[PDB]
Ligand binder design. Sequence first.
Ligand code: MG
Ligand code: MG
Ligand code: MG
Ligand code: MG
Lengths: 23, 554, 478, 139, 139, 137, 136, 137
Amino acid sequence: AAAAAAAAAAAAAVAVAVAVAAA
Amino acid sequence: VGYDDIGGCRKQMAQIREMVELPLRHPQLFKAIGIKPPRGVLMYGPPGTGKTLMARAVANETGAFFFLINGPEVMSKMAGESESNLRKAFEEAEKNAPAIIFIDEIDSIAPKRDKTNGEVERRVVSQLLTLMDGMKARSNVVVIAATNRPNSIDPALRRFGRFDREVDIGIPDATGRLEVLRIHTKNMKLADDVDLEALAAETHGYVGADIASLCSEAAMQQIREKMDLIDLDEDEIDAEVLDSLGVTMDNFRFALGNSNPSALRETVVESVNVTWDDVGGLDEIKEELKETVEYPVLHPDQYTKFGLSPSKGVLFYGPPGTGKTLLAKAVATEVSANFISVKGPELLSMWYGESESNIRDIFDKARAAAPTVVFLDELDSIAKARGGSLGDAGGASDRVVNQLLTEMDGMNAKKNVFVIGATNRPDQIDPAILRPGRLDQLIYVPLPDENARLSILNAQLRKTPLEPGLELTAIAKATQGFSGADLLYIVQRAAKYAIKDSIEAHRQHEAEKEVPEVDPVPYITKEHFAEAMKTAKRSVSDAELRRYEAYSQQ
Amino acid sequence: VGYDDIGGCRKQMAQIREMVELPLRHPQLFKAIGIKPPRGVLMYGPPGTGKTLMARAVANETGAFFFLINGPEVMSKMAGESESNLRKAFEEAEKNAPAIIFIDEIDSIAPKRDKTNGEVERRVVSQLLTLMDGMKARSNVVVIAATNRPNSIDPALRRFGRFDREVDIGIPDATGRLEVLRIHTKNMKLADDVDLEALAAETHGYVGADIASLCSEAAMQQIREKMDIDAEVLDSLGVTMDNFRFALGNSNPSALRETVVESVNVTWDDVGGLDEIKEELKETVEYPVLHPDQYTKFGLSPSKGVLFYGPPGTGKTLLAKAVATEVSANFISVKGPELLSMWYGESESNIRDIFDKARAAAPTVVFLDELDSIAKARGGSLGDAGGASDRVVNQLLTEMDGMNAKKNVFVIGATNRPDQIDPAILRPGRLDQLIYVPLPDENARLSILNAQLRKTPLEPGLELTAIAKATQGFSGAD
Amino acid sequence: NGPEVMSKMAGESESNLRKAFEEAEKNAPAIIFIDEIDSIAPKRDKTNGEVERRVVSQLLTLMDGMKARSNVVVIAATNRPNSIDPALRRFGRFDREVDIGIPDATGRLEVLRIHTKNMKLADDVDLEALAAETHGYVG
Amino acid sequence: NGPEVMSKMAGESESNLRKAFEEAEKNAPAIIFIDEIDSIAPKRDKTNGEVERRVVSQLLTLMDGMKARSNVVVIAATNRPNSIDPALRRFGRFDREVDIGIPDATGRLEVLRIHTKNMKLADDVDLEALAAETHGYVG
Amino acid sequence: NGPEVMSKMAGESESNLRKAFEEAEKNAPAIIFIDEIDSIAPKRDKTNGEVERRVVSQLLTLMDGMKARSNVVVIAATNRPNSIDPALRRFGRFDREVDIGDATGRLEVLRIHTKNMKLADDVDLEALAAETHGYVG
Amino acid sequence: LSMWYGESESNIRDIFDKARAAAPTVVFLDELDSIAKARGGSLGDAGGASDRVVNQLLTEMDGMNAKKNVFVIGATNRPDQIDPAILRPGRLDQLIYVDENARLSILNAQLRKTPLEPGLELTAIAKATQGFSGAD
Amino acid sequence: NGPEVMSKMAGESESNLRKAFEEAEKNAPAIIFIDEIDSIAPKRDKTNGEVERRVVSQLLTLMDGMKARSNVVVIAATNRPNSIDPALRRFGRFDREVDIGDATGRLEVLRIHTKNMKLADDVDLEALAAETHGYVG
Ligand SMILES: [Mg+2]
Ligand SMILES: [Mg+2]
Ligand SMILES: [Mg+2]
Ligand SMILES: [Mg+2]
């Protein structure tokens, strides 16, 4: 007989950064 | 079910009838022309449009056997017997006669090969490929596949020779809606006081099944009044109310005001009803808006005669508290077209791809329930300049703007998607949205004039008991530089002072009773306005007004 | 359970009862009208509102067959067994008699089929679609579903034929809470002093199970008052009104249980001076929430927002604490820069969540401390993080004024730099009254000194008029 | 235990929860202690998997559904409650949340006394001064 | 080792730890050594993904829970303790954090003397002077 | 290869690295060339992904530990060697750093690249070695 | 144009890279004055961005040999505000100067696919409108 | 073709690639047509699978392992020119690409298709080949 299987691998997110100017 | 059940798309119905009968009724013309007729046909479109109904009707008129294969019912319990089950079903279908085979929910067996990660599904799809390929010319059997969404199909299944002809079962027009209404309403005791043309002229985005929902809801409403009057008491049944039953028109109005299209309930907007008399002032502006919104949706013949492509977008800009959101509300409630409300930052998401998927889904629903009016409020939140700073935080905002442009530029006269823009700061609006051909006409909402302001006050104090001997022109002349929000604030403060007077009077009355009219005067007095004027301000400074004036000049 | 248990939602009780009974008591009438009735319904609303209670009541009262399906129960390990279970369930329901299926927590078994990446779930949802509609769809059976997130369902499932009618079992009203209280206090023994009308008035956001929890806690308090076993104490318990007051002063609505504020103890007499501003705040907060009939008599919505501005330490946060402690409406104390996040969009997601809680447990008061931190001018910052602050202020603008309901949200802002606020926030409709909080005068400084010295012993001859005359430019902090 | 219940096969973690609750109800009026519940009760809105959401829905229906629970009391322990599904923080499922926080001076004295009752101390040691000088100790 | 316990399937890393600890407790008092603990004990709430949270919670339960351990000792090794979950840095889980840092002149002299015990030197060789010039060289 | 071994499945790239090291230690004393190590060494502090730190820890475990390596040498390759972990650049893992960054070498490369073909008799390689002053090889 | 630095030159750099990649080509720079602005002296961040844009344009146009045969076409309304450093010989030397008959022809080309009334002449609109343009 | 290289058996795709390459080297100096290369080469950066990486490495090591005595060439067609591995576009495998951006071939295709029917007596397929501009196949 056959059988099934569950799988949950990962995820990927995106970040936000702050910069500094010199006028 | 028969040819008289499926309705609306007459040309599509003729095409499918030719495609399914001719290679089974008369193959001499196919041999004469010299093309082998196909064996597979796809029909797609939004769910609840009539695909399965049409397939069942086709299975009815033709006496050929009709073998329905429910998508998710092809697997089995024992190791490797589903393949044998499908094979034996297909061989019986071929061996018996030139039958008709209907495979439902092809999407269940078409996960695009990328998000599968299984092996039994691979085996079953490959077996289906072999069975479809192994169809001799003498079988004379054709397959009709039913898909809810067209882009989740295995192109291997879409290749020529297996499944070549698709048909977009779309939204029926007004005539299609009227005829389907007749089909549904012909088997009912209909009162004389009925005008199905009005129902098929006020219903816009409905497709296929929600019309049935409308009918059922109306019937239920009729049951409501007849049950309330009859009062059976749930202990017997009478025999006079049934024959004294007639469907009214007000129940149809109630059903129309109650239900919405089946596609857009996911984005159902809370019911707020503002009339055209609520937008005080701006008479010429409202006239221009009415002209812009009523013409593309009602006069296609005029559009053709003009020969000029109407604009498919618009941008409201002006100072805060002038009524941009108010006009959006007025259009949304009484414009006679669908309306999907979206907030700018609402769509953005932290995951990769989800943001663009959200833009794609909202515009897909907008095109599905055509005609529609997508209201983009605070447009400068999602549509800013591109490449403003090196720190683009992954360029996700740039990607979102590019998705909006690429997926909004694919418009035409069809789908009647009208975009309403509304921004507080037009300086940060991307010029790409402002270039000619995309959002051309710009409406500037100025500060109200003295007459316009008097109209605003009368529109805000319409449903408010007020003294007989009182005028508003003095207030209008005094609040010279005010805005609509400021007028709302002054009237609100006056009401607050009035309720204070009412409550203190009631407390004094209760006290003297301890040791009829509720207040000394139910109407707001002139003194309330007189002593509520000490606390108002002007919403926008002269600097902001000058900036908006310069933007208008340029 | 019966129809006398579910309280506070008359429309939904009537709609579900008619839909479930009338087509199963007078089918001939529906053959006379011609059309079939709706046959699938999805109950949705915040948790602890009475969805499962309604299902239990229908199962108990209606004499027809009833089959119950919890969400995950259908799935199994062997391949293609879940669909076999669903088919078996539907066949068992159909074969014996006309029956009612109830699917609890449909969100587990009906994903959107577009964001999911599994296989078995997508086949289970497709099997559900075929069973609910298609060749030999269903006969003399009705399907009820219950959910907390109706938006997590594939739209193809929520079309006519599968789930045509949507009942919205939402938060009750004052009358609904009174009726629920009357239902829940029908079996215990109560003292005469209890007055449920006032208690229902003060329960500003409690929904369903919240009321039950309140009652249970009050009873437990009574049990631990007369336990310091003979029938003398077994009889004559007598849940006093003080027990209910204590339980109400202790519990908070489950919706705001996530953001429960720490119990700070201040009072109005602690705020010296600013008498007129204190009365103005009282007037603007208590009138819409206690006296809605007069507002609807005049046909105008109430004023909501307010912004304190002035020198530091004049008493802005003190006023906010006083509002938090001595007002019946719920309080959401929110920090300025707390709501920001490194990710993309999570700032606006958090803001939307906070305002959703505020509008859910209405009437509610939200305190925005240092409004100039998150709501600054727009576009001034050249070097930015992708305009995240700009999107935050735009989200605030649309959430405080947009396609909302304007039921009861009172926003109080407190900043000492009123020039850095976006002018789009200062317009009426969002923050419509700006209250300056100036430096105290002598009569206010004396009042403040008494306010902070009301728990302190002092020499009898110590007069504070000299101290007040001696401090001229001082503030409350000084 | 928190993560102890889940298995790789699809539809077996929920079976384990079913078995646990059915044994608890079949045997006697029982107590169910779930340690580190934050690992099997996320908010179902920030998560993206499928087995975790399905397990959470299983827990919700098993603790409070039709014929929910008969004289069985559920205890849970966690270090951060804010990362828990709001549907679990309600009367009927998790009636009340007790806050076991940082002991004060008296609490530290009690902890010291209990923990130094089985060892052989010297005669020169007092525990009140030690509990006074120890300030931020969590017990 | 760090990554050697994790697996592709959902709910198997915890099974790996369970069987490992059971093998440790099966026979004799045992010593466990987890090299690079920072790779499988991230700070909870700072990570995106339920598997890391679940494995962290499982480790917490295994080391300190009901009937936690019996005559078994656990040792970990990491380069950045600040990235470890604070719940793991408590008495009963990781109670003594020993700092194996840079040796001094005497320690490095010992290092040279041990390293040059199998190597063949010249007659004119000293290690004290050699140890003196080197300053930052560790191990 | 660097970007080849990295994947999105949790616990799969570490399994690939362990399988590669077991295959290198199974048959014979061999030489491992892991190319483009800067993509799979994000210094464990600038990155946000957990799989990169996990495969970094897997690399340090396979290179050093109890019975780590039995007569097998690993070779790396990168363009910027500063974006590697200081624990990766330690003794026992990458203890020798070779800088492979002139005219005589370019002439030798021209001679060894023009070896299997008779080009001509009057071709002078001096101009070919002097004009191609910026050719890497 | 990028309000930041470098990017606003990298855009023109990779535009000219696409130009030299798709040889031969025509680079139609619309509204040259808006870009050049006769860099001169402005003494600000906008002045520095304008000077960097003009220097990038000059160093990415003067480097075009007989190979790659690109061709830059500019157009403007005001020729006063164009940079003489870009009107120099060797970079861009041609000067094409651009009526009633052209207005009538433009109206007849604009009214091509239009069902016009037969009894209508556009010469009256051509004679009445003198200083108009095709857009108006 | 592209997606016709996979099977249930693990690694069967590399065996199929080796079988095809050894058949083309065994039979004659010939030409191999690999249609729809965008399915086999997923550009190696956006993908997350492992059998796609394995089949890309197998195609790389089979295209590189062709000597002078093989005398076989490979032809590959694609739809988009951007989703291709640069390692497949490296010097050695694919360097000479054509940019196909006629009426005689269209008339030939018409005379191929429509020559098996009782057509008409007043037809001119030259006009259909002239008026048909962008059709193919
Ligand atoms: Mg259908
Ligand atoms: Mg607005
Ligand atoms: Mg429930
Ligand atoms: Mg403060």
